[PDB]
Design a protein around this ligand. Structure first.
Ligand SMILES: *[C@@H]1O[C@H](CO)[C@@H](O)[C@H](O)[C@H]1NC(C)=O
Length: 135
């Protein structure tokens, strides 16, 4: 009987009624005995999308932070030089690659100085490219 109810309602099998979900509460599937609690977005989080009767609120991260996980359940500090922002958060550049930008950019590979005739003056790290000699 309660299976005839649609999303944004709750319904108890002993007394079938498709009652609207109360405030700050939702249900994406209809006709369950209770509605789920709305997620509040505060502190490091802000609302991307407000809660409605049929779907949860979605959170976003404040300035200087980015979302971590599929439901943005954690914020992570924006990455430092020597790191790139992947879809799974900040990953340190692997051996042979670098990034010199703060809070942006991607891990590029080191300049091979011997593509020209040039020699290496300075070795490479995760934050600095190798420096080559004279052309
Ligand atoms: C640079 O290029 C040479 C010539 O193809 C290659 O053999 C070597 O592995 C490279 N070396 C570095 C340090 O990238």
């Amino acid at each position: 009987s309660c299976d005839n109810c649609q999303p944004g309602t709750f319904c108890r099998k002993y007394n079938p009624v498709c009652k609207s979900c109360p405030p700050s509460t939702f249900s994406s599937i209809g006709g369950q005995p209770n509605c789920n609690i709305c997620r509040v977005c505060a502190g490091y989080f802000r609302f991307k999308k407000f809660c409605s009767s049929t779907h949860n609120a979605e959170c976003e991260c404040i300035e200087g932070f980015h979302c971590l996980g599929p439901q943005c359940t954690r914020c992570e500090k924006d990455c430092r030089p020597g790191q790139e922002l992947t879809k799974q958060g900040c990953k340190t550049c692997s051996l042979g690659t670098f990034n010199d930008q703060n809070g942006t950019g991607v891990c590029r590979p080191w300049t091979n100085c011997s593509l020209d005739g040039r020699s290496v003056l300075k070795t490479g790290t995760t934050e600095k490219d190798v420096v080559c000699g004279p052309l």
